[PDB]
Amino acid sequence: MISDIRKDAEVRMDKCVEAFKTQISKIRTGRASPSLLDGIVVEYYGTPTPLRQLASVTVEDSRTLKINVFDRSMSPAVEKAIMASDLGLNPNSAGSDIRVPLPPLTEERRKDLTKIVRGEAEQARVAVRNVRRDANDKVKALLKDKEISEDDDRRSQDDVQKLTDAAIKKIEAALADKEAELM
Amino acid sequence: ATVNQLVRKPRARKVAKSNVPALEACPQKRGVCTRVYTTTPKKPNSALRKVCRVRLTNGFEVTSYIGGEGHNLQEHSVILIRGGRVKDLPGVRYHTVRGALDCSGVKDRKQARSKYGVKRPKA
RNA sequence: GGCCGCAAGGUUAAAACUCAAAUGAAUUGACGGGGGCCCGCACAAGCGGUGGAGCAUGUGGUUUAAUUCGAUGCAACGCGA
RNA sequence: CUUACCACUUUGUGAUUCAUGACUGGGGUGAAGUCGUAACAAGGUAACCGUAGGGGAACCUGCGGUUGGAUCACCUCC
RNA sequence: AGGAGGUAAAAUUCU
Numbered sequence A: 001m002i003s004d005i006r007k008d009a010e011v012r013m014d015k016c017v018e019a020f021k022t023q024i025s026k027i028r029t030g031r032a033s034p035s036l037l038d039g040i041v042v043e044y045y046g047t048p049t050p051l052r053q054l055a056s057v058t059v060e061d062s063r064t065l066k067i068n069v070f071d072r073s074m075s076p077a078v079e080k081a082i083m084a085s086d087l088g089l090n091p092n093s094a095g096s097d098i099r100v101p102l103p104p105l106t107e108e109r110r111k112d113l114t115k116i117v118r119g120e121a122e123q124a125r126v127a128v129r130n131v132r133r134d135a136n137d138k139v140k141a142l143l144k145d146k147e148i149s150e151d152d153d154r155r156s157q158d159d160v161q162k163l164t165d166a167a168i169k170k171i172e173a174a175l176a177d178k179e180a181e182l183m
Numbered sequence B: 001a002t003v004n005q006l007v008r009k010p011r012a013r014k015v016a017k018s019n020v021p022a023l024e025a026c027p028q029k030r031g032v033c034t035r036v037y038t039t040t041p042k043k044p045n046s047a048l049r050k051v052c053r054v055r056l057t058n059g060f061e062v063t064s065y066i067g068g069e070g071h072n073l074q075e076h077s078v079i080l081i082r083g084g085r086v087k088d089l090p091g092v093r094y095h096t097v098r099g100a101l102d103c104s105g106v107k108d109r110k111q112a113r114s115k116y117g118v119k120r121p122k123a
Numbered sequence C: 001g002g003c004c005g006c007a008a009g010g011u012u013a014a015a016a017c018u019c020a021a022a023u024g025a026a027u028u029g030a031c032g033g034g035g036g037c038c039c040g041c042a043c044a045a046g047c048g049g050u051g052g053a054g055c056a057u058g059u060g061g062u063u064u065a066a067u068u069c070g071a072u073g074c075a076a077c078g079c080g081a
Numbered sequence D: 001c002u003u004a005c006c007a008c009u010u011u012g013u014g015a016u017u018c019a020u021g022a023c024u025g026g027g028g029u030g031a032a033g034u035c036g037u038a039a040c041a042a043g044g045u046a047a048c049c050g051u052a053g054g055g056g057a058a059c060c061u062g063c064g065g066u067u068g069g070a071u072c073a074c075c076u077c078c
Numbered sequence E: 001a002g003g004a005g006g007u008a009a010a011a012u013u014c015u
Protein backbone atom coordinates (compact mmCIF):
# COMPACT_ATOMS: atom_id res chain seq x y z
CA MET A 1 0.00 0.00 0.00
CA ILE A 2 0.97 3.65 0.47
CA SER A 3 3.18 2.75 3.43
CA ASP A 4 5.96 0.95 1.61
CA ILE A 5 6.19 3.62 -1.07
CA ARG A 6 6.05 6.55 1.29
CA LYS A 7 9.22 5.21 2.86
CA ASP A 8 10.50 4.12 -0.53
CA ALA A 9 10.02 7.55 -2.01
CA GLU A 10 11.83 8.91 1.03
CA VAL A 11 15.04 6.88 0.83
CA ARG A 12 15.37 7.54 -2.89
CA MET A 13 15.24 11.31 -2.11
CA ASP A 14 17.46 12.00 0.89
CA LYS A 15 19.92 9.76 -0.93
CA CYS A 16 19.39 11.91 -3.99
CA VAL A 17 20.70 14.90 -2.01
CA GLU A 18 23.66 12.92 -0.69
CA ALA A 19 24.95 12.70 -4.24
CA PHE A 20 24.84 16.45 -4.75
CA LYS A 21 26.85 17.02 -1.57
CA THR A 22 29.07 14.30 -3.07
CA GLN A 23 29.52 15.99 -6.49
CA ILE A 24 30.09 19.48 -5.07
CA SER A 25 32.93 17.74 -3.29
CA LYS A 26 35.00 17.25 -6.46
CA ILE A 27 35.17 21.00 -7.17
CA ARG A 28 38.06 23.26 -6.16
CA THR A 29 37.09 26.33 -4.14
CA GLY A 30 39.53 28.73 -2.48
CA ARG A 31 39.22 26.93 0.87
CA ALA A 32 41.37 23.90 1.73
CA SER A 33 38.72 21.14 1.65
CA PRO A 34 40.60 17.86 2.21
CA SER A 35 37.70 15.86 0.81
CA LEU A 36 39.02 17.05 -2.58
CA LEU A 37 41.92 14.59 -2.57
CA ASP A 38 39.80 12.18 -0.48
CA GLY A 39 38.16 10.93 -3.66
CA ILE A 40 41.08 10.67 -6.10
CA VAL A 41 42.10 7.67 -8.18
CA VAL A 42 45.68 6.70 -7.36
CA GLU A 43 48.01 3.79 -8.03
CA TYR A 44 50.72 2.53 -5.69
CA TYR A 45 52.82 -0.63 -5.96
CA GLY A 46 50.12 -3.27 -6.40
CA THR A 47 46.55 -1.95 -6.58
CA PRO A 48 44.35 1.21 -6.93
CA THR A 49 42.36 2.48 -3.85
CA PRO A 50 42.48 6.22 -2.94
CA LEU A 51 45.22 7.86 -0.86
CA ARG A 52 42.92 7.50 2.15
CA GLN A 53 44.81 4.25 2.65
CA LEU A 54 48.19 6.01 2.97
CA ALA A 55 48.38 9.71 3.88
CA SER A 56 46.59 12.21 6.12
CA VAL A 57 44.96 14.88 3.96
CA THR A 58 45.39 17.79 6.42
CA VAL A 59 45.89 21.59 6.06
CA GLU A 60 48.35 24.48 6.51
CA ASP A 61 45.97 27.38 5.90
CA SER A 62 42.87 28.38 3.96
CA ARG A 63 45.09 28.71 0.87
CA THR A 64 47.37 25.68 1.32
CA LEU A 65 47.08 22.03 2.21
CA LYS A 66 49.61 19.70 3.85
CA ILE A 67 49.88 16.00 3.03
CA ASN A 68 51.17 14.15 6.07
CA VAL A 69 52.20 10.66 4.97
CA PHE A 70 53.75 7.45 6.21
CA ASP A 71 56.48 6.07 3.89
CA ARG A 72 58.91 8.31 1.97
CA SER A 73 59.55 6.31 -1.20
CA MET A 74 56.28 7.14 -3.02
CA SER A 75 56.45 10.94 -2.78
CA PRO A 76 56.94 11.26 -6.53
CA ALA A 77 54.61 8.26 -7.09
CA VAL A 78 51.55 10.08 -5.79
CA GLU A 79 52.78 13.57 -6.74
CA LYS A 80 52.16 12.57 -10.33
CA ALA A 81 48.99 10.76 -9.32
CA ILE A 82 47.82 14.12 -7.94
CA MET A 83 49.57 16.35 -10.49
CA ALA A 84 47.85 14.65 -13.39
CA SER A 85 44.24 14.32 -12.40
CA ASP A 86 42.04 16.97 -13.88
CA LEU A 87 42.60 19.40 -10.95
CA GLY A 88 45.53 21.64 -11.90
CA LEU A 89 47.62 21.27 -8.77
CA ASN A 90 51.42 21.42 -8.91
CA PRO A 91 52.65 19.92 -5.61
CA ASN A 92 55.90 21.25 -4.17
CA SER A 93 58.42 18.58 -3.22
CA ALA A 94 59.58 20.75 -0.33
CA GLY A 95 59.97 17.38 1.39
CA SER A 96 57.88 15.82 4.16
CA ASP A 97 54.53 17.49 3.45
CA ILE A 98 53.66 17.32 -0.23
CA ARG A 99 52.69 20.98 -0.28
CA VAL A 100 49.66 21.36 -2.56
CA PRO A 101 48.75 25.04 -2.84
CA LEU A 102 45.25 26.46 -3.36
CA PRO A 103 45.43 29.12 -6.06
CA PRO A 104 42.80 31.88 -5.49
CA LEU A 105 39.31 32.38 -6.88
CA THR A 106 40.32 34.20 -10.09
CA GLU A 107 36.85 35.79 -10.49
CA GLU A 108 36.40 33.93 -13.76
CA ARG A 109 35.92 31.30 -10.99
CA ARG A 110 33.89 33.17 -8.42
CA LYS A 111 31.58 33.02 -11.44
CA ASP A 112 31.33 30.25 -14.15
CA LEU A 113 32.50 27.80 -11.46
CA THR A 114 29.64 29.01 -9.26
CA LYS A 115 27.41 28.46 -12.34
CA ILE A 116 28.37 24.77 -12.23
CA VAL A 117 27.33 24.12 -8.62
CA ARG A 118 23.95 25.83 -8.99
CA GLY A 119 23.45 23.84 -12.16
CA GLU A 120 24.53 20.62 -10.44
CA ALA A 121 22.12 21.69 -7.75
CA GLU A 122 19.32 22.03 -10.24
CA GLN A 123 19.69 18.59 -11.73
CA ALA A 124 19.70 17.19 -8.19
CA ARG A 125 16.38 18.89 -7.77
CA VAL A 126 15.06 17.40 -11.00
CA ALA A 127 15.92 13.92 -9.76
CA VAL A 128 14.00 14.55 -6.58
CA ARG A 129 11.07 16.10 -8.53
CA ASN A 130 10.96 12.87 -10.52
CA VAL A 131 11.01 10.57 -7.49
CA ARG A 132 7.95 12.69 -6.79
CA ARG A 133 6.39 11.88 -10.21
CA ASP A 134 6.81 8.18 -9.71
CA ALA A 135 5.98 7.98 -6.04
CA ASN A 136 2.45 9.18 -6.58
CA ASP A 137 2.06 7.46 -9.93
CA LYS A 138 1.99 4.37 -7.75
CA VAL A 139 -0.51 6.08 -5.47
CA LYS A 140 -2.72 7.31 -8.37
CA ALA A 141 -2.48 3.82 -9.86
CA LEU A 142 -3.51 1.86 -6.82
CA LEU A 143 -6.52 4.22 -6.62
CA LYS A 144 -8.14 3.52 -9.99
CA ASP A 145 -7.81 0.00 -8.75
CA LYS A 146 -10.14 0.60 -5.78
CA GLU A 147 -7.60 -0.03 -2.92
CA ILE A 148 -7.44 3.59 -1.71
CA SER A 149 -10.02 6.22 -0.88
CA GLU A 150 -9.94 9.51 -2.77
CA ASP A 151 -9.19 11.01 0.63
CA ASP A 152 -6.40 8.49 1.19
CA ASP A 153 -5.06 9.41 -2.25
CA ARG A 154 -5.27 13.16 -1.64
CA ARG A 155 -3.51 12.84 1.74
CA SER A 156 -0.83 10.76 0.05
CA GLN A 157 -0.38 12.96 -3.02
CA ASP A 158 0.46 15.80 -0.65
CA ASP A 159 2.96 14.53 2.00
CA VAL A 160 4.80 13.10 -1.00
CA GLN A 161 5.01 16.82 -1.62
CA LYS A 162 6.20 17.28 1.93
CA LEU A 163 8.98 14.79 1.13
CA THR A 164 10.09 16.61 -2.07
CA ASP A 165 9.87 20.02 -0.45
CA ALA A 166 12.00 19.11 2.55
CA ALA A 167 14.42 17.13 0.44
CA ILE A 168 14.93 20.18 -1.82
CA LYS A 169 15.51 22.31 1.32
CA LYS A 170 18.48 20.05 2.02
CA ILE A 171 19.79 20.37 -1.59
CA GLU A 172 19.24 24.10 -1.59
CA ALA A 173 20.75 24.87 1.77
CA ALA A 174 23.75 22.60 1.18
CA LEU A 175 24.38 24.50 -2.04
CA ALA A 176 23.79 27.83 -0.37
CA ASP A 177 26.75 27.77 2.00
CA LYS A 178 28.86 26.02 -0.61
CA GLU A 179 28.19 29.23 -2.58
CA ALA A 180 29.77 31.13 0.35
CA GLU A 181 32.99 29.23 -0.40
CA LEU A 182 33.65 31.81 -3.15
CA MET A 183 31.13 34.68 -2.85
CA ALA B 1 48.90 28.77 -69.62
CA THR B 2 48.24 31.60 -72.09
CA VAL B 3 50.31 34.73 -71.87
CA ASN B 4 47.03 36.45 -72.62
CA GLN B 5 45.61 34.79 -69.52
CA LEU B 6 48.59 35.65 -67.33
CA VAL B 7 48.32 39.25 -68.41
CA ARG B 8 44.64 39.14 -67.44
CA LYS B 9 44.99 37.28 -64.13
CA PRO B 10 48.68 37.40 -63.03
CA ARG B 11 50.60 34.87 -60.95
CA ALA B 12 49.29 34.17 -57.45
CA ARG B 13 51.59 33.79 -54.45
CA LYS B 14 50.90 31.92 -51.22
CA VAL B 15 51.08 34.09 -48.06
CA ALA B 16 52.13 33.73 -44.39
CA LYS B 17 51.02 30.41 -42.87
CA SER B 18 52.16 31.86 -39.52
CA ASN B 19 52.37 28.91 -37.09
CA VAL B 20 52.50 31.18 -34.01
CA PRO B 21 50.23 34.17 -33.51
CA ALA B 22 52.40 35.82 -30.91
CA LEU B 23 50.43 38.78 -32.30
CA GLU B 24 52.87 41.54 -33.35
CA ALA B 25 55.22 38.87 -34.67
CA CYS B 26 57.03 39.27 -31.37
CA PRO B 27 59.92 37.15 -30.26
CA GLN B 28 57.92 36.58 -27.07
CA LYS B 29 54.84 37.72 -25.16
CA ARG B 30 54.05 37.92 -21.51
CA GLY B 31 51.07 36.10 -20.06
CA VAL B 32 49.29 34.69 -17.00
CA CYS B 33 48.61 31.00 -16.45
CA THR B 34 44.87 30.40 -16.80
CA ARG B 35 45.67 26.91 -15.52
CA VAL B 36 48.41 24.26 -15.45
CA TYR B 37 47.29 21.02 -17.15
CA THR B 38 48.92 17.64 -17.69
CA THR B 39 48.00 15.86 -20.94
CA THR B 40 49.22 12.78 -22.80
CA PRO B 41 51.28 12.88 -26.05
CA LYS B 42 50.43 11.75 -29.60
CA LYS B 43 50.70 8.29 -31.07
CA PRO B 44 53.84 6.29 -30.55
CA ASN B 45 54.78 8.02 -27.31
CA SER B 46 53.41 7.80 -23.80
CA ALA B 47 53.92 10.22 -20.92
CA LEU B 48 52.43 12.81 -18.55
CA ARG B 49 53.38 16.00 -20.37
CA LYS B 50 53.37 19.24 -18.37
CA VAL B 51 51.74 22.32 -19.75
CA CYS B 52 49.76 25.50 -18.97
CA ARG B 53 46.93 27.56 -20.48
CA VAL B 54 47.93 31.20 -20.60
CA ARG B 55 46.13 34.53 -21.21
CA LEU B 56 48.67 37.04 -22.45
CA THR B 57 49.06 40.78 -23.05
CA ASN B 58 47.02 40.93 -26.23
CA GLY B 59 43.80 39.04 -25.49
CA PHE B 60 44.79 35.66 -26.88
CA GLU B 61 44.14 32.72 -24.62
CA VAL B 62 46.69 30.07 -25.56
CA THR B 63 48.44 26.98 -24.24
CA SER B 64 52.12 26.35 -23.77
CA TYR B 65 54.56 23.58 -22.91
CA ILE B 66 56.73 23.92 -19.79
CA GLY B 67 59.84 21.86 -20.32
CA GLY B 68 62.75 20.39 -18.46
CA GLU B 69 62.67 17.95 -15.57
CA GLY B 70 60.65 19.59 -12.79
CA HIS B 71 58.96 22.98 -13.08
CA ASN B 72 57.24 25.11 -10.44
CA LEU B 73 54.33 27.43 -11.15
CA GLN B 74 50.58 27.84 -10.56
CA GLU B 75 47.64 30.23 -11.21
CA HIS B 76 49.25 33.42 -10.04
CA SER B 77 52.14 32.87 -12.47
CA VAL B 78 53.08 35.33 -15.16
CA ILE B 79 55.34 33.63 -17.66
CA LEU B 80 57.18 34.67 -20.73
CA ILE B 81 56.03 32.82 -23.82
CA ARG B 82 58.17 32.14 -26.93
CA GLY B 83 57.53 30.53 -30.28
CA GLY B 84 57.58 26.76 -29.95
CA ARG B 85 55.84 23.48 -30.80
CA VAL B 86 55.58 19.91 -29.56
CA LYS B 87 55.18 17.11 -32.15
CA ASP B 88 53.50 14.95 -29.60
CA LEU B 89 50.31 16.51 -28.25
CA PRO B 90 49.13 18.48 -31.32
CA GLY B 91 47.18 21.11 -29.35
CA VAL B 92 50.36 23.05 -28.56
CA ARG B 93 52.21 25.67 -30.57
CA TYR B 94 54.28 27.33 -27.85
CA HIS B 95 57.04 26.99 -25.28
CA THR B 96 57.35 28.75 -21.97
CA VAL B 97 60.80 30.22 -21.34
CA ARG B 98 62.50 29.01 -18.17
CA GLY B 99 63.91 31.72 -15.92
CA ALA B 100 61.73 34.52 -17.24
CA LEU B 101 60.02 36.83 -14.81
CA ASP B 102 58.26 34.10 -12.69
CA CYS B 103 58.42 30.41 -13.61
CA SER B 104 62.08 29.86 -12.64
CA GLY B 105 64.77 27.64 -14.17
CA VAL B 106 65.47 23.93 -13.85
CA LYS B 107 66.74 22.49 -10.59
CA ASP B 108 70.28 21.08 -10.94
CA ARG B 109 70.96 21.64 -14.66
CA LYS B 110 74.52 21.89 -16.03
CA GLN B 111 74.32 20.70 -19.63
CA ALA B 112 72.53 23.09 -22.07
CA ARG B 113 71.18 25.34 -19.32
CA SER B 114 71.02 28.51 -21.36
CA LYS B 115 67.86 26.74 -22.50
CA TYR B 116 66.42 26.33 -19.02
CA GLY B 117 67.58 29.63 -17.48
CA VAL B 118 70.09 28.32 -14.95
CA LYS B 119 72.96 30.25 -13.40
CA ARG B 120 76.34 28.49 -13.29
CA PRO B 121 77.34 26.26 -10.34
CA LYS B 122 80.37 28.36 -9.30
CA ALA B 123 82.89 29.01 -12.13
C1' G C 1 26.96 36.99 -49.10
C1' G C 2 24.89 37.41 -54.14
C1' C C 3 21.93 35.21 -58.13
C1' C C 4 18.46 31.08 -59.50
C1' G C 5 14.51 27.52 -57.55
C1' C C 6 7.55 25.64 -55.35
C1' A C 7 10.80 22.73 -52.82
C1' A C 8 14.61 19.44 -53.02
C1' G C 9 18.69 22.05 -53.67
C1' G C 10 21.85 24.49 -57.60
C1' U C 11 25.77 28.17 -58.91
C1' U C 12 29.91 31.58 -57.28
C1' A C 13 33.24 30.44 -52.82
C1' A C 14 36.47 31.43 -48.23
C1' A C 15 38.37 31.11 -42.91
C1' A C 16 40.13 29.50 -38.24
C1' C C 17 41.80 24.57 -36.93
C1' U C 18 44.90 19.86 -37.69
C1' C C 19 48.60 16.45 -39.96
C1' A C 20 53.94 15.07 -42.53
C1' A C 21 52.08 13.05 -45.22
C1' A C 22 47.92 12.26 -48.92
C1' U C 23 48.31 10.65 -54.14
C1' G C 24 49.79 8.03 -59.03
C1' A C 25 51.97 3.80 -62.11
C1' A C 26 54.73 -0.40 -61.61
C1' U C 27 57.56 -4.35 -58.32
C1' U C 28 58.11 -8.63 -55.17
C1' G C 29 55.61 -11.71 -52.01
C1' A C 30 51.17 -12.97 -49.25
C1' C C 31 46.50 -13.70 -49.12
C1' G C 32 40.88 -14.41 -51.61
C1' G C 33 33.94 -17.12 -48.96
C1' G C 34 38.91 -16.07 -57.71
C1' G C 35 40.20 -19.69 -61.51
C1' G C 36 43.69 -23.91 -63.81
C1' C C 37 46.75 -28.04 -62.81
C1' C C 38 48.87 -31.76 -59.01
C1' C C 39 50.33 -34.33 -54.67
C1' G C 40 49.84 -36.60 -48.98
C1' C C 41 45.86 -42.24 -44.56
C1' A C 42 43.67 -35.39 -46.57
C1' C C 43 39.07 -37.26 -48.02
C1' A C 44 36.41 -41.13 -49.89
C1' A C 45 36.41 -47.20 -49.19
C1' G C 46 37.20 -50.35 -45.16
C1' C C 47 39.30 -52.33 -40.14
C1' G C 48 40.04 -51.56 -35.28
C1' G C 49 39.83 -47.23 -31.57
C1' U C 50 39.52 -42.50 -27.87
C1' G C 51 35.32 -39.58 -26.12
C1' G C 52 31.24 -43.42 -21.47
C1' A C 53 33.33 -47.11 -17.28
C1' G C 54 37.33 -48.46 -13.53
C1' C C 55 42.55 -47.98 -13.00
C1' A C 56 47.98 -46.18 -14.59
C1' U C 57 50.16 -41.64 -15.92
C1' G C 58 50.69 -36.60 -17.38
C1' U C 59 48.66 -31.65 -17.14
C1' G C 60 45.34 -27.30 -15.81
C1' G C 61 43.00 -25.54 -11.34
C1' U C 62 42.28 -25.82 -6.23
C1' U C 63 44.56 -26.91 -1.98
C1' U C 64 49.24 -26.62 0.94
C1' A C 65 54.11 -24.40 5.56
C1' A C 66 56.10 -27.00 0.49
C1' U C 67 53.12 -28.97 -2.89
C1' U C 68 61.03 -27.62 -6.85
C1' C C 69 61.99 -25.46 -11.93
C1' G C 70 60.86 -26.14 -17.27
C1' A C 71 57.45 -27.67 -21.68
C1' U C 72 51.23 -24.80 -23.55
C1' G C 73 47.22 -25.12 -30.93
C1' C C 74 49.02 -28.33 -34.84
C1' A C 75 54.84 -28.82 -33.18
C1' A C 76 52.94 -28.58 -24.50
C1' C C 77 49.84 -32.42 -21.52
C1' G C 78 53.31 -41.60 -20.25
C1' C C 79 56.97 -34.27 -22.80
C1' G C 80 62.83 -32.56 -19.93
C1' A C 81 62.05 -37.67 -16.06
C1' C D 1 22.33 95.00 -37.01
C1' U D 2 21.32 91.82 -41.10
C1' U D 3 22.03 88.45 -45.48
C1' A D 4 24.90 84.05 -47.85
C1' C D 5 28.50 80.20 -46.94
C1' C D 6 29.54 76.76 -43.25
C1' A D 7 32.29 73.56 -38.63
C1' C D 8 30.15 71.28 -33.94
C1' U D 9 25.43 69.30 -32.56
C1' U D 10 20.02 67.26 -33.11
C1' U D 11 15.61 64.03 -34.92
C1' G D 12 13.82 60.35 -37.99
C1' U D 13 15.01 55.89 -41.31
C1' G D 14 17.80 52.66 -44.22
C1' A D 15 22.74 50.53 -45.28
C1' U D 16 27.21 48.48 -43.96
C1' U D 17 30.78 46.45 -40.64
C1' C D 18 33.73 44.58 -36.28
C1' A D 19 33.44 42.52 -31.22
C1' U D 20 29.84 39.90 -28.11
C1' G D 21 25.41 35.73 -27.00
C1' A D 22 21.80 31.33 -23.73
C1' C D 23 21.78 27.54 -26.72
C1' U D 24 23.01 24.78 -30.86
C1' G D 25 25.19 22.45 -35.81
C1' G D 26 28.81 20.03 -37.80
C1' G D 27 34.41 19.87 -38.14
C1' G D 28 39.63 18.70 -35.81
C1' U D 29 42.40 16.13 -32.43
C1' G D 30 43.33 12.74 -28.26
C1' A D 31 47.24 3.99 -27.20
C1' A D 32 44.53 -0.09 -24.93
C1' G D 33 36.46 2.10 -23.99
C1' U D 34 30.95 0.32 -26.19
C1' C D 35 28.14 -1.62 -30.78
C1' G D 36 28.10 -4.09 -35.06
C1' U D 37 31.33 -5.24 -40.00
C1' A D 38 30.15 -0.95 -44.64
C1' A D 39 35.06 -1.17 -47.78
C1' C D 40 39.61 -3.60 -49.77
C1' A D 41 39.74 -10.85 -52.39
C1' A D 42 33.76 -12.33 -56.49
C1' G D 43 35.09 -8.49 -49.22
C1' G D 44 31.15 -13.36 -49.16
C1' U D 45 24.34 -8.92 -51.96
C1' A D 46 30.70 -6.24 -57.61
C1' A D 47 31.77 -1.35 -56.43
C1' C D 48 30.96 3.64 -57.25
C1' C D 49 28.45 8.63 -59.29
C1' G D 50 23.98 11.64 -59.43
C1' U D 51 18.87 11.26 -57.03
C1' A D 52 15.03 9.85 -53.78
C1' G D 53 12.79 7.19 -49.59
C1' G D 54 13.82 4.25 -45.38
C1' G D 55 17.01 3.08 -40.96
C1' G D 56 21.03 2.71 -33.85
C1' A D 57 25.38 3.04 -36.89
C1' A D 58 28.58 1.77 -40.76
C1' C D 59 24.44 1.51 -44.31
C1' C D 60 19.92 -0.49 -47.01
C1' U D 61 16.34 0.04 -51.37
C1' G D 62 14.46 1.87 -56.07
C1' C D 63 16.00 4.90 -61.12
C1' G D 64 19.40 5.81 -64.39
C1' G D 65 24.97 6.23 -65.43
C1' U D 66 30.56 4.43 -65.11
C1' U D 67 34.36 0.51 -65.24
C1' G D 68 37.52 2.66 -61.84
C1' G D 69 34.37 -5.71 -62.41
C1' A D 70 36.03 -11.24 -60.01
C1' U D 71 34.57 -15.91 -62.58
C1' C D 72 34.08 -20.26 -67.98
C1' A D 73 36.15 -25.67 -64.88
C1' C D 74 32.12 -29.98 -64.36
C1' C D 75 27.48 -31.27 -66.48
C1' U D 76 23.17 -32.35 -70.11
C1' C D 77 22.06 -30.83 -74.76
C1' C D 78 23.83 -30.20 -79.31
C1' A E 1 33.79 -30.20 -83.83
C1' G E 2 30.45 -24.04 -82.41
C1' G E 3 26.48 -22.41 -79.64
C1' A E 4 22.79 -23.41 -75.22
C1' G E 5 21.17 -24.00 -70.79
C1' G E 6 21.95 -25.55 -65.61
C1' U E 7 25.99 -26.45 -61.52
C1' A E 8 29.50 -22.59 -54.68
C1' A E 9 23.44 -19.81 -49.62
C1' A E 10 23.48 -17.38 -44.77
C1' A E 11 28.28 -17.61 -41.71
C1' U E 12 31.25 -11.93 -37.27
C1' U E 13 35.80 -11.06 -34.76
C1' C E 14 41.47 -10.51 -33.24
C1' U E 15 46.16 -3.89 -27.70
Ligand SMILES: NC[C@@H]1O[C@H](O[C@H]2[C@@H](O)[C@H](O[C@@H]3[C@@H](O)[C@H](N)C[C@H](N)[C@H]3O[C@H]3O[C@H](CO)[C@@H](O)[C@H](O)[C@H]3N)O[C@@H]2CO)[C@H](N)[C@@H](O)[C@@H]1O
Pocket (backbone or CB within 6 Å): D030, D033
Ligand atom coordinates in the same frame (compact mmCIF):
# COMPACT_ATOMS: atom_id res chain seq x y z
N1 LIG F 1 39.74 11.04 -36.19
C1 LIG F 1 38.99 11.52 -37.33
C2 LIG F 1 37.51 11.31 -37.10
O1 LIG F 1 37.36 10.07 -36.41
C3 LIG F 1 36.01 9.79 -36.11
O2 LIG F 1 35.95 8.67 -35.25
C4 LIG F 1 36.14 9.08 -33.91
C5 LIG F 1 35.71 7.95 -33.04
O3 LIG F 1 34.94 7.05 -33.82
C6 LIG F 1 37.01 7.32 -32.62
O4 LIG F 1 36.93 6.73 -31.33
C7 LIG F 1 37.67 5.51 -31.25
C8 LIG F 1 36.70 4.42 -31.66
O5 LIG F 1 36.17 4.64 -32.96
C9 LIG F 1 37.43 3.11 -31.66
N2 LIG F 1 36.56 2.09 -32.21
C10 LIG F 1 37.79 2.80 -30.22
C11 LIG F 1 38.72 3.86 -29.65
N3 LIG F 1 38.83 3.63 -28.23
C12 LIG F 1 38.24 5.29 -29.86
O6 LIG F 1 39.38 6.11 -29.66
C13 LIG F 1 39.08 7.44 -29.26
O7 LIG F 1 38.98 7.53 -27.85
C14 LIG F 1 40.18 7.19 -27.19
C15 LIG F 1 39.92 7.16 -25.70
O8 LIG F 1 38.51 7.28 -25.51
C16 LIG F 1 41.22 8.24 -27.51
O9 LIG F 1 42.44 7.85 -26.89
C17 LIG F 1 41.44 8.38 -28.99
O10 LIG F 1 42.05 9.65 -29.21
C18 LIG F 1 40.16 8.35 -29.81
N4 LIG F 1 40.50 7.89 -31.13
O11 LIG F 1 37.96 8.36 -32.60
C19 LIG F 1 37.61 9.29 -33.61
C20 LIG F 1 37.89 10.68 -33.10
O12 LIG F 1 39.11 10.66 -32.36
C21 LIG F 1 35.32 9.50 -37.42
N5 LIG F 1 36.04 8.47 -38.13
C22 LIG F 1 35.32 10.77 -38.24
O13 LIG F 1 34.51 11.73 -37.58
C23 LIG F 1 36.73 11.30 -38.42
O14 LIG F 1 37.40 10.47 -39.36
Ligand SMILES: [Mg+2]
Pocket (backbone or CB within 6 Å): none
Ligand atom coordinates in the same frame (compact mmCIF):
# COMPACT_ATOMS: atom_id res chain seq x y z
MG1 LIG G 1 51.19 -44.21 -47.12
Ligand SMILES: [Mg+2]
Pocket (backbone or CB within 6 Å): none
Ligand atom coordinates in the same frame (compact mmCIF):
# COMPACT_ATOMS: atom_id res chain seq x y z
MG1 LIG H 1 36.77 -42.29 -43.07
Ligand SMILES: [Mg+2]
Pocket (backbone or CB within 6 Å): C050
Ligand atom coordinates in the same frame (compact mmCIF):
# COMPACT_ATOMS: atom_id res chain seq x y z
MG1 LIG I 1 35.80 -45.74 -26.40
Ligand SMILES: [Mg+2]
Pocket (backbone or CB within 6 Å): none
Ligand atom coordinates in the same frame (compact mmCIF):
# COMPACT_ATOMS: atom_id res chain seq x y z
MG1 LIG J 1 30.20 19.06 -31.16
Ligand SMILES: [Mg+2]
Pocket (backbone or CB within 6 Å): D037, D043
Ligand atom coordinates in the same frame (compact mmCIF):
# COMPACT_ATOMS: atom_id res chain seq x y z
MG1 LIG K 1 32.15 -7.69 -44.56
Ligand SMILES: [Mg+2]
Pocket (backbone or CB within 6 Å): none
Ligand atom coordinates in the same frame (compact mmCIF):
# COMPACT_ATOMS: atom_id res chain seq x y z
MG1 LIG L 1 29.99 -5.87 -51.60
Ligand SMILES: [Mg+2]
Pocket (backbone or CB within 6 Å): none
Ligand atom coordinates in the same frame (compact mmCIF):
# COMPACT_ATOMS: atom_id res chain seq x y z
MG1 LIG M 1 21.79 -0.16 -58.90
Ligand SMILES: [Mg+2]
Pocket (backbone or CB within 6 Å): none
Ligand atom coordinates in the same frame (compact mmCIF):
# COMPACT_ATOMS: atom_id res chain seq x y z
MG1 LIG N 1 35.66 -12.71 -42.05
Ligand SMILES: [Mg+2]
Pocket (backbone or CB within 6 Å): none
Ligand atom coordinates in the same frame (compact mmCIF):
# COMPACT_ATOMS: atom_id res chain seq x y z
MG1 LIG O 1 33.86 -6.15 -31.24
